[PDB]
Design a protein around this ligand. Structure first.
Ligand SMILES: *SCc1cc(N[C@@H](C)CN)c2cc(C(=N)N)sc2c1
Ligand SMILES: *SCc1cc(N[C@@H](C)CN)c2cc(C(=N)N)sc2c1
Ligand SMILES: [Cl-]
Ligand SMILES: [Cl-]
Ligand SMILES: [Mg+2]
Ligand SMILES: [Mg+2]
Ligand SMILES: [Mg+2]
Ligand SMILES: [Mg+2]
Lengths: 10, 236, 236, 10
């Protein structure tokens, strides 16, 4: 799945 | 619990060691133990808690998506049955993921959130509550998916209200909250226009407040602003 | 054990899924369960077993070295005492590492090695026995360090003898064995000249046998030959 | 520690 940017690591 | 006999300070020290060793399951257990000492957390301790569990659940989400994709491939037309194993193992990982989310939500509920009086702590914890309901929603499919989603929404919304009243637009906690709430909107709530609007407004109001910041705070805020832009570039 | 109620084939299938998900602790537990079904392992199943545990113990070794370095820093002259925590957590990781090595050695002893009649299986398992005694030796400091080292040496040496008698010089198992035995010599047995000699002879005898190989076998063998060269470049 | 090359992953 294309993962969008969220806060923090990994 | 398992960490009840270790000193709070030792648990924090060992959480920091585990981070350096990239032992994030250890890191999370130490920070769980530190939370259960019952004292409120410092800014650094909150971040240790979040980094630990974010790393643990991140591994589970990555694994779950791999297994979910295989499983969907194995249920498409023209596919040789391979038995229950893919579904079973996807369920195994999913159950462990849900257990981690339930553990984090338990810590927030008992009693981090109710004791968090300051905006920077209460917003941090409410954002985390929204995040871990969001991770639950990513794998939910049943009669509770809608309520899980609304739980995420409700937590993010309370955190947004407080942050808008109590924090500047460049506050990194406020910015990371808005980033994550916009992703919630985009792919959990299937509200892409809400997602885009939130990200643009967040970016623009931060940009107009950067002039008030030191060089160190500027670097913190612009780092998260870049994530808002990265998403907007894909969404528009 | 914990996996006693799952079918052998399902455990192997799920080991392969776990590998794709980068869930190596799961992968190792599934392959442990498959070994304990009591049947000998295929070439693919041996490699699944080795890859799983190599990934698990690799994480532990990386963490142990980080913690060991901190601990030595904290015991140098002019260093502010920080209490027992670094030592304690280094011991925690070390104990978990030793437990993994003991588990693998238990599988080899009960009863993979004694049932391995063919050279390719017996050499594979004896190499693994040498490897996991080597990982134990990396963290050993007490009255058993010398015997741990000799256990590694003895396993590697039996594997070398069989491989020299029964396998061509380009056989990837034979080459990986010689690679690892040479590293044993270099930094475990403090025999750098033995290490260098073994690596050179191994490289040169393989190089002279490459002409007998298909393109696919050539690629397999030269991949490990490059590791021999990489080390020789640092050692000479 | 400088780790030398050994067989297989990590
Ligand atoms: S409140 C001081 C503080 C801030 C951070 N992270 C900032 C970039 C904002 N989240 C922080 C991260 C820590 C860690 N990964 N150990 S400790 C700490 C403290
Ligand atoms: S015996 C066939 C076989 C060989 C390998 N690895 C070769 C490169 C030699 N070690 C192998 C790796 C597997 C895995 N990581 N799943 S399965 C398999 C089979
Ligand atoms: Cl399973
Ligand atoms: Cl510990
Ligand atoms: Mg105390
Ligand atoms: Mg389920
Ligand atoms: Mg059966
Ligand atoms: Mg010890």
């Amino acid at each position: 799945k294309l993962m969008f940017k969220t806060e923090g690591p990994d | 619990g398992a960490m009840g006999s270790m000193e709070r300070a030792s648990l924090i020290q060992k959480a920091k060691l585990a981070e350096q060793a990239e032992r994030y399951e250890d890191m999370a257990a130490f920070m769980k133990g530190a939370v259960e000492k019952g004292e409120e957390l410092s800014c650094e301790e909150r971040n240790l808690l979040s980094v630990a569990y974010k790393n643990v659940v991140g591994g589970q989400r990555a694994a779950w998506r791999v297994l979910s994709s295989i499983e969907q491939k194995s249920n498409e037309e023209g596919s040789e049955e391979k038995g229950p194993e893919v579904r079973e193992y996807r369920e195994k990982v999913e159950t462990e993921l849900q257990g981690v989310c339930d553990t984090v939500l338990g810590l927030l509920d008992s009693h981090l959130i109710k004791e968090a009086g300051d905006a920077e702590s209460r917003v941090f914890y409410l954002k985390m509550k929204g995040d871990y309901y969001r991770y639950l929603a990513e794998v939910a499919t049943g009669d509770d998916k809608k309520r899980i989603i609304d739980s995420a929404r409700s937590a993010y919304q309370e955190a947004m209200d407080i942050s808008k009243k109590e924090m500047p637009p460049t506050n990194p906690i406020r910015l990371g909250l808005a980033l994550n709430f916009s992703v919630f909107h985009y792919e959990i709530a299937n509200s892409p226009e809400e997602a885009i609007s939130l990200a643009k407004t967040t970016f623009d109001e931060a940009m107009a407040d950067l002039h008030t910041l030191s060089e160190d705070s500027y670097k913190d805020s612009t780092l998260i602003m870049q994530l808002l832009r990265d998403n907007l570039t894909l969404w528009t």
